[PDB]
Scaffold this motif. Structure first.
Motif, PDB file in Angstrom:
ATOM      1  N   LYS A 299       0.815  -1.209   0.000  1.00 35.30           N
ATOM      2  CA  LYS A 299       0.000   0.000   0.000  1.00 35.30           C
ATOM      3  C   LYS A 299       0.851   1.263   0.000  1.00 35.30           C
ATOM      4  N   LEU A 300       2.091   1.175   0.475  1.00 30.59           N
ATOM      5  CA  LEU A 300       2.996   2.316   0.521  1.00 30.59           C
ATOM      6  C   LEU A 300       3.784   2.476  -0.773  1.00 30.59           C
ATOM      7  N   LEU A 301       4.174   1.364  -1.398  1.00 31.65           N
ATOM      8  CA  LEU A 301       4.947   1.430  -2.634  1.00 31.65           C
ATOM      9  C   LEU A 301       4.134   2.065  -3.754  1.00 31.65           C
ATOM     10  N   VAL A 302       2.972   1.482  -4.061  1.00 27.63           N
ATOM     11  CA  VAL A 302       2.084   2.044  -5.070  1.00 27.63           C
ATOM     12  C   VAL A 302       1.709   3.480  -4.741  1.00 27.63           C
ATOM     13  N   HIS A 303       1.775   3.855  -3.466  1.00 29.15           N
ATOM     14  CA  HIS A 303       1.431   5.214  -3.057  1.00 29.15           C
ATOM     15  C   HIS A 303       2.482   6.174  -3.584  1.00 29.15           C
ATOM     16  N   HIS A 304       3.692   5.671  -3.778  1.00 31.98           N
ATOM     17  CA  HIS A 304       4.776   6.514  -4.264  1.00 31.98           C
ATOM     18  C   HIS A 304       4.982   6.359  -5.763  1.00 31.98           C
ATOM     19  N   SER A 305       6.232   6.235  -6.188  1.00 26.40           N
ATOM     20  CA  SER A 305       6.537   6.154  -7.618  1.00 26.40           C
ATOM     21  C   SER A 305       6.844   4.734  -8.078  1.00 26.40           C
ATOM     22  N   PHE A 306       6.323   3.742  -7.367  1.00 32.05           N
ATOM     23  CA  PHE A 306       6.584   2.354  -7.729  1.00 32.05           C
ATOM     24  C   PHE A 306       6.069   2.066  -9.122  1.00 32.05           C
ATOM     25  N   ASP A 307       4.917   2.619  -9.463  1.00 33.23           N
ATOM     26  CA  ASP A 307       4.410   2.453 -10.812  1.00 33.23           C
ATOM     27  C   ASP A 307       5.465   2.934 -11.799  1.00 33.23           C
ATOM     28  N   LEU A 308       6.094   4.069 -11.514  1.00 32.30           N
ATOM     29  CA  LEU A 308       7.073   4.636 -12.429  1.00 32.30           C
ATOM     30  C   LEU A 308       8.258   3.715 -12.669  1.00 32.30           C
ATOM     31  N   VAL A 309       8.526   2.777 -11.762  1.00 30.87           N
ATOM     32  CA  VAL A 309       9.718   1.948 -11.863  1.00 30.87           C
ATOM     33  C   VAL A 309       9.410   0.503 -12.238  1.00 30.87           C
ATOM     34  N   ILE A 310       8.243  -0.023 -11.885  1.00 26.45           N
ATOM     35  CA  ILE A 310       7.927  -1.396 -12.251  1.00 26.45           C
ATOM     36  C   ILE A 310       7.374  -1.481 -13.670  1.00 26.45           C
ATOM     37  N   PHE A 311       6.773  -0.402 -14.173  1.00 29.13           N
ATOM     38  CA  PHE A 311       6.324  -0.405 -15.557  1.00 29.13           C
ATOM     39  C   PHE A 311       7.501  -0.304 -16.512  1.00 29.13           C
ATOM     40  N   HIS A 312       8.578   0.364 -16.093  1.00 30.54           N
ATOM     41  CA  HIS A 312       9.734   0.503 -16.969  1.00 30.54           C
ATOM     42  C   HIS A 312      10.465  -0.822 -17.129  1.00 30.54           C
ATOM     43  N   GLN A 313      10.711  -1.524 -16.021  1.00 31.90           N
ATOM     44  CA  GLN A 313      11.452  -2.781 -16.083  1.00 31.90           C
ATOM     45  C   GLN A 313      10.751  -3.784 -16.990  1.00 31.90           C
ATOM     46  N   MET A 314       9.491  -4.097 -16.690  1.00 31.91           N
ATOM     47  CA  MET A 314       8.736  -5.066 -17.472  1.00 31.91           C
ATOM     48  C   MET A 314       8.478  -4.615 -18.905  1.00 31.91           C
ATOM     49  N   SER A 315       8.898  -3.409 -19.288  1.00 29.74           N
ATOM     50  CA  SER A 315       8.685  -2.917 -20.639  1.00 29.74           C
ATOM     51  C   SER A 315       9.937  -2.344 -21.287  1.00 29.74           C
ATOM     52  N   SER A 316      11.085  -2.363 -20.605  1.00 24.28           N
ATOM     53  CA  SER A 316      12.331  -1.842 -21.170  1.00 24.28           C
ATOM     54  C   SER A 316      12.980  -2.876 -22.091  1.00 24.28           C
ATOM     55  N   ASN A 317      12.206  -3.299 -23.091  1.00 22.65           N
ATOM     56  CA  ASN A 317      12.641  -4.298 -24.066  1.00 22.65           C
ATOM     57  C   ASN A 317      13.110  -5.582 -23.388  1.00 22.65           C
ATOM     58  N   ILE A 318      12.462  -5.949 -22.278  1.00 17.43           N
ATOM     59  CA  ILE A 318      12.817  -7.188 -21.592  1.00 17.43           C
ATOM     60  C   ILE A 318      12.472  -8.392 -22.457  1.00 17.43           C
ATOM     61  N   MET A 319      11.347  -8.332 -23.165  1.00 16.99           N
ATOM     62  CA  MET A 319      11.090  -9.330 -24.191  1.00 16.99           C
ATOM     63  C   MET A 319      12.175  -9.244 -25.256  1.00 16.99           C
ATOM     64  N   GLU A 320      12.542 -10.394 -25.833  1.00 20.90           N
ATOM     65  CA  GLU A 320      13.640 -10.472 -26.824  1.00 20.90           C
ATOM     66  C   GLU A 320      14.988 -10.381 -26.121  1.00 20.90           C
ATOM     67  N   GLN A 321      14.974 -10.249 -24.797  1.00 20.70           N
ATOM     68  CA  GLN A 321      16.221 -10.234 -24.028  1.00 20.70           C
ATOM     69  C   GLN A 321      16.202 -11.381 -23.028  1.00 20.70           C
ATOM     70  N   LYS A 322      17.292 -12.134 -22.948  1.00 15.66           N
ATOM     71  CA  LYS A 322      17.319 -13.303 -22.065  1.00 15.66           C
ATOM     72  C   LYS A 322      17.659 -12.978 -20.618  1.00 15.66           C
ATOM     73  N   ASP A 323      16.779 -12.252 -19.937  1.00 19.12           N
ATOM     74  CA  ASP A 323      16.990 -11.941 -18.539  1.00 19.12           C
ATOM     75  C   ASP A 323      15.787 -12.558 -17.868  1.00 19.12           C
ATOM     76  N   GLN A 324      15.550 -13.830 -18.165  1.00 24.48           N
ATOM     77  CA  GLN A 324      14.434 -14.603 -17.615  1.00 24.48           C
ATOM     78  C   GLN A 324      14.523 -14.779 -16.113  1.00 24.48           C
ATOM     79  N   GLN A 325      15.746 -14.867 -15.609  1.00 25.75           N
ATOM     80  CA  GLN A 325      15.992 -14.971 -14.190  1.00 25.75           C
ATOM     81  C   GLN A 325      15.451 -13.715 -13.524  1.00 25.75           C
ATOM     82  N   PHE A 326      15.741 -12.565 -14.111  1.00 25.87           N
ATOM     83  CA  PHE A 326      15.272 -11.317 -13.572  1.00 25.87           C
ATOM     84  C   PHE A 326      13.766 -11.147 -13.637  1.00 25.87           C
ATOM     85  N   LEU A 327      13.185 -11.168 -14.843  1.00 25.66           N
ATOM     86  CA  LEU A 327      11.753 -10.954 -15.030  1.00 25.66           C
ATOM     87  C   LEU A 327      10.933 -11.819 -14.080  1.00 25.66           C
TER      88      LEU A 327
END
Lengths: 364, 529
Positions: free
Chosen positions: A90-118
């Motif tokens: 409830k505190l993370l989403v209250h801040h800028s967590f959206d700003l940082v979790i949307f970037h990771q899952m969309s920073s061209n992670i597809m087509e990149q083999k960082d499956q361990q990370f995702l």
């Protein structure tokens, strides 16, 4: 420039003898040496062992969006905190967590083999989206920023799109911010009330859009099962061929499959959601333009993109408008109109070329 | 009456369409047509000897469903016979809506009429019930149920799609050990009997030739007699080269690889001696089996066959055999030999250590085993178990309170009998029980389970009917234990026809009711505010 050594020392002894104001100083040393010397910024690792903790995580990962594998040390911390204090989300989403979790899952992670990370980030996201209310803001705060991939994920996880103010809601908002057509197409195809989509026209009618309007008409007035366009009750001030274009069917239209990206994340999160919950031709004919107060229809009497689908109209209604002077060129284009009615308009003379139509009956 | 219903828009998927004019009751509840219009009138209100009830508005509504069904055919003829416009219906003696007036059957509302059209007032469904059985999204898609003749056991069907003027469904027979085809129309429902073989039939396929304007039918029987008869002439027959085991699966493909039109046929023997043929050579007695590809062994019987969803990859075929799934192409050679028994997700074994039944081809592969309550989502390239969808994970979630006796039924019945995949929307799974599963393969699994309409969904496939294309034939069963003590059951096969738009309608309607519930409450607030 000694805090790096201090934290490097603490990281050693924090492990072996089971150490027990530790977390306090290791937090202020971030705010004391921020945005620089990422080596002392690796201290996040120790946090895995006062909401200031929230504001210092989302601000650290964001400022280092693509720095290095410190996100892997950041999210590991955020995941470790979540599994013991589920309320923390409830505190993370209250801040800028959206700003940082949307970037990771969309920073061209597809087509990149960082499956361990995702798999880590999706596991972390699997808990931020647990609460029914949090999805409703994880979603809403993904529409302001144009993000088609994530707004599709939060829909396959629930998060109704007809909840914001009822009188006003997402579709009314998404149409004001000059969004992308792919973004509107996901709210309509999901749960979306009619009284809110209709209000999105007048908002999107004022501005001239050819793809945000033609996506609302397609959901408001198109009976594909009966080959019709029921645009009656709408008070559309004027009709243009660029809107009705995409409504008429096309046989060439065939697409690839790209939304599978958002479909993968939809199940990966759902997988970690359960595993954490289980264990613990056919030319359309009817075209109705009744109540739309049209003071002129000339925009259709040209050689526009629809002048090949109007030749199979077989019915056209323009009653209760404020028309006058039915255009001569049009009444020779739709050579298959067999039911035309235009009454309550403000005519002042019979065109007398309407009868030159090829196959007409029931002129009204 | 059809005059007191004030439409608001002609768009089907709208929120406010019909609205009954409410001023009439106000003028009555104050100044107390109290008997009602003659034609649209109940028997209890016309006789006038009994006070009314809520069950009078239902008989009057039952007639409203009779004028909507027949699109106002009773009223048009009722204007030149008004004394017979009322008395004919004033006793429940009004005719069949289909036999008199030409209209599509809609056989789940011809039953709702025959309930709201009963003589006894308290035997008609109360208003709350007449809506709870209109809210069903399966009543609005079931196009026509066709009761087959009494005690006919059919386990195979095939449609005719090269003629779209009208269509017929060529069936088989099981109630005799000697096989016989059973032609069946769709608009006349004339079930025809014609013995064509001396051994029970197992599967059929429809081969059409673009020349000569004909489309023969082929018959696979347990003896192996592959017989072919013409569509028109039921006398020109030639039993092709007999096989060795019992034919079990046939098919007609799209393999036009000679820069022109050409096609084959794939007889699936009960050991894998897949004999390939040609579309135009079927006429000759004893045709040439082009490439008999003995795949497995006598202990490995073929039980299915399929073809790709897209035509871009050149219609790669994916056919099952025993427990070993394979594939081929224009080369007619095995290019994949995925095997399922060697599965490392063991909770139970023989669900994968059993014979295959059917396989459908999409971005993944869905597979069915004998007596298997689970479908196996394999992959093409990876050849891994990407998904395992058990049936009772859905059935046991609705069959909790409405089914109480089942607590002694831990040896559950209901197993996957057939698969059918809509183009890109949903997947139709026919359970051995009376259920049929609608799985949205894209996002959410369970859409709806359409039960209590048959007892055993034995065959299911798609077709196109008279320019109203894209229907989903569903050949279920029905058995009544009238003489169960005589170790015999009376089976009644019940072919149905579902609108293929069902998985949309069932979720498009469940939204349609939500929006109206949200309006029915907000309208109650304008009273207090």
């Amino acid at each position: 420039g000694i805090q790096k050594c201090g934290l490097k020392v603490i990281s050693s002894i924090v492990h072996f003898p089971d150490a027990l104001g530790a977390m306090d100083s290791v937090l202020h040393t971030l705010q004391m040496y921020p945005d620089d010397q990422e080596i002392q910024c690796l201290g996040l690792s120790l946090i895995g062992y006062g909401h200031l903790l929230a504001k210092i995580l989302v601000s650290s990962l964001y400022r280092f969006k693509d720095v290095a594998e410190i996100q892997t040390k950041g999210f590991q911390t955020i995941l470790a905190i979540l599994k013991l204090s589920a309320s923390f989300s409830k505190l993370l989403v209250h801040h800028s967590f959206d700003l940082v979790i949307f970037h990771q899952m969309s920073s061209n992670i597809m087509e990149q083999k960082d499956q361990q990370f995702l798999n880590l980030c999706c596991k972390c996201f699997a808990k931020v989206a647990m609460d029914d209310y949090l999805k409703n803001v994880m979603l809403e705060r993904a529409c302001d920023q144009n993000n088609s991939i994530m707004v599709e994920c939060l829909l396959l996880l629930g998060a109704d799109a007809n909840q914001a103010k009822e009188g006003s809601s997402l579709i009314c908002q998404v149409c004001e911010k000059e969004s992308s057509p792919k973004l509107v197409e996901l709210l309509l195809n999901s749960g979306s009330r009619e009284q809110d989509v209709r209000k999105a026209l007048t908002i999107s009618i004022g501005k001239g859009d050819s793809q945000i309007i033609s996506l609302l008409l397609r959901r408001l007035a198109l009976d594909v099962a009966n080959n019709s366009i029921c645009l009656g009750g709408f008070c559309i001030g004027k009709v243009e061929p660029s809107w009705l274009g995409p409504l008429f069917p096309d046989k060439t239209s065939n697409l690839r499959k790209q939304t599978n990206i958002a479909s993968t994340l939809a199940r990966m999160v759902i997988r970690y959601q359960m595993k954490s919950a289980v264990e613990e031709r056919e030319y359309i004919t009817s075209l109705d333009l009744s109540a739309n107060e049209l003071r002129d229809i000339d925009a259709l009497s040209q050689k526009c993109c629809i002048s090949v689908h109007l030749e199979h109209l077989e019915k056209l209604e323009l009653h209760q408008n404020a028309l006058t002077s039915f255009p001569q060129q049009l009444c020779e284009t739709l050579k298959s109109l067999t039911h035309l009615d235009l009454h309550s308009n403000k005519f002042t003379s019979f065109p007398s070329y309407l009868l030159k139509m090829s196959c007409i009956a029931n002129l009204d | 009456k059809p005059h007191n219903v004030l439409l608001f828009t002609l768009y089907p998927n709208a929120a406010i369409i019909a609205k009954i004019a409410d001023y009439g009751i106000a003028q009555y509840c104050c100044r107390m047509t109290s008997e009602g219009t003659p034609g649209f009138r109940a028997p209890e209100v016309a006789r006038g000897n009994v006070i009314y009830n809520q069950q009078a508005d239902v008989y009057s509504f039952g007639l409203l469903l009779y004028d909507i069904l027949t699109t106002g055919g009773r009223i048009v003829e009722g204007l030149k016979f008004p004394n017979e416009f009322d008395e004919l219906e004033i006793q429940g003696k009004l005719p069949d809506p289909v036999k008199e007036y030409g209209c599509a059957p809609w056989p789940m509302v011809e039953k709702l009429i025959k309930q709201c059209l009963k003589e006894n007032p308290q035997e008609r469904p109360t208003s709350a019930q007449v809506f709870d059985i209109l809210n069903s999204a399966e009543l609005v898609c079931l196009t026509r149920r066709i009761l087959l003749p009494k005690n006919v056991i059919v386990e195979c069907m095939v449609a005719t799609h090269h003629n779209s003027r009208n269509a017929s469904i060529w069936l088989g027979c099981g109630h005799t050990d000697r096989g016989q085809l059973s032609f069946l129309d769709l608009n006349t429902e004339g079930y025809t009997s014609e013995e064509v073989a001396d051994s029970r039939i197992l599967c059929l396929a429809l081969v059409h030739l673009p020349v000569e304007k004909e489309s023969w039918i082929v018959s696979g029987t347990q003896s192996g007699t592959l017989l072919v008869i013409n569509t028109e002439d039921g006398k020109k027959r030639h039993t092709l080269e007999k096989m060795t085991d019992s034919v079990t699966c046939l098919y007609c493909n799209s393999f036009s690889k000679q820069s022109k039109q050409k096609n084959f046929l794939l007889v699936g023997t009960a050991d894998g001696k897949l004999a390939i043929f040609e579309d135009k050579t079927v006429k000759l007695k004893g045709a040439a089996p082009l490439k008999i590809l003995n795949i497995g062994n006598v202990s490995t019987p073929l039980m299915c066959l399929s073809e790709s969803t897209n035509s871009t990859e050149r219609n790669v075929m994916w056919g099952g055999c025993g427990t070993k799934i394979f594939s081929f192409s224009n080369d007619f050679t095995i290019q994949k030999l995925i095997e399922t028994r060697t599965s490392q997700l063991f909770s139970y074994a023989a669900f994968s250590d059993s014979n295959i039944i059917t396989v459908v081809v999409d971005t993944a592969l869905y597979i069915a085993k004998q007596n298997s309550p689970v479908v196996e989502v394999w992959d093409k390239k990876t050849e891994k178990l990407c998904g395992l969808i058990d049936c009772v994970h859905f059935l046991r979630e609705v069959t909790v309170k409405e089914n109480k006796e089942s607590k002694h039924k831990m040896s559950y019945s209901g197993r996957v009998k057939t698969l059918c995949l809509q183009k890109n929307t949903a997947l139709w799974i026919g359970t051995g029980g009376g259920h049929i599963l609608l799985l949205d393969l894209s996002t959410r699994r369970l859409i709806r389970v359409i039960y209590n309409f048959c007892n055993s969904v034995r065959v299911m496939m798609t077709a196109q009917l008279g320019s109203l294309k894209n229907v989903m034939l569903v050949l279920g069963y029905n058995r009544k234990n009238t003489e169960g003590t005589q170790k015999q059951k009376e089976i009644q096969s019940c072919l149905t026809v579902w609108d293929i738009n069902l998985p949309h309608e069932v979720q498009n309607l469940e939204k349609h009711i939500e929006v109206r519930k949200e309006l029915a409450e907000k309208m109650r607030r304008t009273s207090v505010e």
